[PDB]
Structure formats: structure tokens, C-alpha cells
Amino acid sequence: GEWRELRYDSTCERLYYGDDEKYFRKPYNFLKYHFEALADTGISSEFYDN
Amino acid sequence: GVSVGKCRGILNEIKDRNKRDTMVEDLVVLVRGGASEHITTLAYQELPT
């Protein structure tokens, strides 16, 4: 999922994502690498005055 | 001649004051998809967008 880092080409005036390495090999001992994306951010605030 | 006098005085003062204040805030975010740098930028809990 990280195939969007950066790449520039001055001679061609071309700006695009680096297309060199987009593949991940899975060893035999690994079932699946489960490329996904989740995010849960929660802030808690408590202000009491007596 | 007989002279007699009597005097009496009393003062009472009571003061009471109470102040109570409370405020809390909570935040819950649930994002699925594209866990790259931009969604981490958007994961900023303080700013809403």
C-alpha cells in the first residue's frame, strides 16, 4: 500500500509515484500479510471543579 | 434614693457560599482505508477537519 512515496524526472519533466519496487514476498512460515488499513483515534477529557 | 439600670445586646451573622462547575468532552474516531501519512494528518483529534 506504500506505492505512492515519490519520484521525479528532470529530463522529461515527469512527476509520478516511484514504480521501482511494488511487491512483497511472503515466506513459507507466514499465512497471509493481510494488507488493510484501520484507524481509531480517541481522546478523553475530564475537567471537574469543586 | 435608688438607681438601677440594665443593658443587653446580641449580634448573629452567618454566611455560606457554594460553587461547583464541571465540564468534559469525548471523541471517537473510526477510519478504515488508506492508513498512510495523510490519514495520520487527519487523525488529529483536536482539529475536526
Q: What are phi and psi of B25, to 5 degrees?
A: -145, 145
- Residues B42 and A40 sit within 8 Å (Cβ to Cβ): no
- B43 contacts A41? CB cut-off 8 A: yes
SS3 B40: helix
- B21 contacts A42? CB cut-off 8 A: no
Question: Resolution in angstroms for this experimental structure?
Answer: 5.6
How close B16 gets to chain A, by Cα (Å)? 15
Residue B31 Cα to chain centre, angstroms: 33
- Residues A37 and B32 sit within 8 Å (Cβ to Cβ): yes
Q: What are phi and psi of B6, to 5 degrees?
A: -145, 140
